[model samples]
Target: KTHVQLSLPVLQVRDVLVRGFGDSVEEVLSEARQHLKDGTCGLVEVEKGVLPQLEQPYVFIKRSDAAPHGHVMVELVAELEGIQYGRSGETLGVLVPHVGEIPVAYRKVLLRK
Candidate 1:
């Protein structure tokens, strides 16, 4: 895949469960939620391949306990850049940011669903 620009409506509900210690990645959102930018905004990024397939047909978030089974973690909005394609790969994950403190709802308006 040659560097493509895709604006995904991403949410970060998984990190909150396993965000512990100074891991290689999660510190980006792990404690940032505990102390957001003066209560401004935040979103957690999943694995690289995780988001490429999120089309919303599968809204049931399992293997999770923090949120209810049928609750969406983040509401995908078309007016924002939820996923950042940095021409590289890992940086793409760093772009999953929602406008809240508890890692709420996110959904892409035009991508799918």
Candidate 2:
């Protein structure tokens, strides 16, 4: 197979899971929701890659009962349109910031309806 290389813009989401050690899930969820909704949670980075495949945008949310550090964790998945070439993880990180935070509503809450 022939290999290809290119550069593209991706989203990257970055932030601390807890403001304090004793943070609660509701509080953590609330902040994540707000930051994601307002588009002020993460940063975006352009990256070089091999043409990524385009796919329907999707979000994956996992809620844990407790964290090792007694903190709440929130994570979302975003489908990318391009290729997974060279340091794909870094490329995905770039995409996260661009898309901002994924609204919690997109998770099980809406799926249940």
Candidate 3:
């Protein structure tokens, strides 16, 4: 799969840590959005339909060099309000990897310009 560097960028949200792109901020946010819609962000609702692994949930960002202007920082932060379980249809695991198959989680996002 995508074996990114160990020093990946991720944000800590309660027990779940959100890891995004390391090399490029755009890539990171793209993947992050996937997780959010994958029900990973709302894994509490298990009764929902089994999404197409990633048939949806995406976001786009504008790209621009800060050479003449200046560098801008980006962040993807979130806080776990609470364990959302509706009577229990399936034991949604918050510990799931940031990506579908990857093995890792991130928290406390910070992008420096």
Candidate 4:
């Protein structure tokens, strides 16, 4: 078989389960939710691959339960259009507003959901 070696763009999680040492899930979720509205950790808008195509998908996130660290962990996922590829294997970061951009690799993650 021939490996096309198409590194398509997909969603990713820059940050993982971080602990505050002693925080609650609600507090962290609230903060993350705020960032989502402001466009920090919510999603990214970028282009990927050789012949790229536009992508617009929401990234759902969950707060971590930090009993000792006081922070919450986050889990991200593509709400729609999980991962699509272009004819030549490419994808845009953000096909729509607020819908972040990322590579298809981000789909591989373990979540409680």
Predicted candidate 2 versus true structure: per-residue lDDT over 1-113, tens digit per residue:
12111122222223322111113334433443454454443323223531122112322233322232332233433332332211211122221222334332221111110
Between prediction 2 and prediction 3, the one with superior TM-score is 2
Error of 3 at 1 (Å): 31
Of the two candidates 3 and 4, the one with more favorable lDDT, higher being better, is: 4
Q: What is the C-alpha RMSD of each candidate to the true structure, in Å?
A: 15.8, 17.3, 15.7, 18.0
The stretch of ten residues in a row with the least summed lDDT in candidate 4 is: 1-10
Clashes of each: 9, 16, 9, 22
Kindly provide the TM-score of model 2 when superposed on the true structure, using C-alpha atoms: 0.24
lDDT of each residue in 1-113, candidate 3, tens digit only: 12111123222333333322222334444454464434343221112333222112222121121221232222232212232212212222222234333323332211221
Q: Residues 1-113, candidate 1: write the lDDT tens digits.
A: 21211233345645433322232223433333332223322334556665443322111111211223333222222111244211211122223333433544442211111
In Å, residue 19's CA in model 3 sits off its true spot by: 4.5
List TM-scores for all candidates, in order.
0.21, 0.24, 0.22, 0.24
lDDT of 1: 0.30
Candidate 3 residue 7 C-alpha distance from true site, Å: 27
Candidate 4, 52-107: lDDT as tens digits: 33223333333322212322233433323345221211212321222444344521
* Candidate-wise lDDT, in order: 0.30, 0.28, 0.28, 0.30
Worst 10 residues of 3 by lDDT: 59-68
Model 2 misplaced regions, further than 4 Å: 1-22, 43-113
How well does candidate 3 match the true structure in TM-score terms? 0.22
List clashing residue pairs in candidate 3.
10-107, 11-106, 11-107, 11-108, 12-107, 12-108, 17-106, 18-106, 21-28
